[PDB]
Write a protein that binds this ligand. Structure first.
Ligand SMILES: [Ca+2]
Ligand SMILES: [Ca+2]
Ligand SMILES: [Ca+2]
Ligand SMILES: [Cl-]
Length: 341
């Protein structure tokens, strides 16, 4: 087992209804040579992240929302997405008044590739991989064009005014979205991105509704991930239905955070719930599978990779209350599909 002192708490990696990540590590695959993009709130300066991060980019076009004094820039630092005093609108509704910072991008990035076997904090699913932090979300969320520009750039797509990505990603994690359908424009950019050879893994959403009512789940050519609990049941908030392809642990997920309620204060570790968390488990397992395929000189298309992940899932705990794809992502079974027994 990894020596990270909080690994023992990461049930979602090795326990019942977890992703069996440990069995693949045992086999010698950790996502070596794979680049994974995290399209999210950005990245923290964190001892359990730094070593596994490659250069990213800050696509937030609004300086005030980015909280860094400029528009788009080459520093995807998460400055905090908190707000107070109805800064994001909605006055006088008390429920719209304030939120603490999420450190969402960092929690997600830690699930994919937290520095492992370093005697500190936690482990990551694909800890031999590297992450490019693609910052698209700041105060009050994110702009449509910033998110998709970031996604496209992640795969090696050229964006005017931005230096070209020298670390194109084979897996793009998008733990974001909201209510909506997929426009022909939004579908066009998704298609451009995935047909470069990158798998787009997305969170199904947290509205306890059919995922077809949400973006990017309403889009084609993405891998939509629902959230399961330690009981191997559907997390009550998880979106569901035919547009969800598989599930992964999405409650009680321990990963890398900051303690700061507003700006960064101090690196730490914390539990979070959401389909946003489930998604990085799948992204991590995708990286594991790619590292296994690389070892035998086998090329996998995103279509082939997604097929492997979906067809090799482990069973839910009995029948669920809604459709949530084929089962829970199983790294051991996924790698078995590429290398054999
Ligand atoms: Ca900026
Ligand atoms: Ca920045
Ligand atoms: Ca660690
Ligand atoms: Cl240019």
């Amino acid at each position: 087992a990894p020596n990270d002192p909080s690994y023992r708490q990461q049930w979602h990696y090795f326990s019942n209804y977890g992703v069996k990540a440990d069995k693949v590590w045992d086999r010698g695959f950790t996502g070596q040579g794979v680049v994974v993009s995290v399209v999210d709130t950005g990245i923290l300066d964190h001892v359990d992240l730094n070593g596994n991060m490659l250069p990213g980019y800050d696509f937030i076009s609004s300086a005030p929302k980015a909280r860094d004094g400029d528009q788009r820039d080459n520093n995807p630092a998460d400055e905090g997405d908190w707000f107070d005093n109805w800064d994001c609108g909605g006055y006088p509704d008390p429920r719209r008044e304030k939120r603490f910072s999420t450190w969402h991008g960092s929690h997600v990035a830690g699930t994919i590739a937290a520095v492992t076997n370093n005697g500190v904090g936690v482990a990551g699913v694909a800890y031999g991989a590297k992450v490019i932090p693609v910052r698209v979300l700041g105060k009050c969320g994110g702009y449509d064009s910033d998110i998709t520009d970031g996604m496209y750039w992640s795969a090696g797509g050229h964006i005017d005014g931005v230096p070209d990505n020298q670390n194109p990603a084979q897996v793009i994690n998008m733990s974001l979205g909201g209510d909506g359908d997929c426009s022909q424009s939004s579908q066009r950019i998704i298609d451009k991105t995935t047909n470069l050879g990158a798998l787009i893994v997305i969170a199904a959403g947290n509205e306890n509704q059919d995922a077809s009512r949400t973006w990017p789940s309403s889009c084609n050519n993405v891998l939509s991930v629902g959230a399961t609990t330690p009981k191997g049941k559907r997390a009550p908030f998880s979106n569901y239905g035919a547009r969800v392809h598989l599930a992964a642990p999405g409650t009680n997920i321990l990963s890398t955070i900051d303690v700061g309620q507003a700006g960064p204060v101090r690196s730490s570790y914390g539990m979070k719930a959401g389909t946003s968390m489930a998604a990085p488990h799948v992204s991590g397992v995708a990286a594991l599978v790619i590292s296994a395929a690389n070892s035998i000189g086998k090329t996998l298309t995103p279509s082939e990779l997604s097929d492997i992940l979906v067809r090799t899932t482990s069973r839910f705990n009995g029948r669920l209350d809604r459709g949530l794809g084929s089962g829970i992502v199983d790294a051991n079974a996924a790698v078995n599909a590429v290398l054999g027994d």
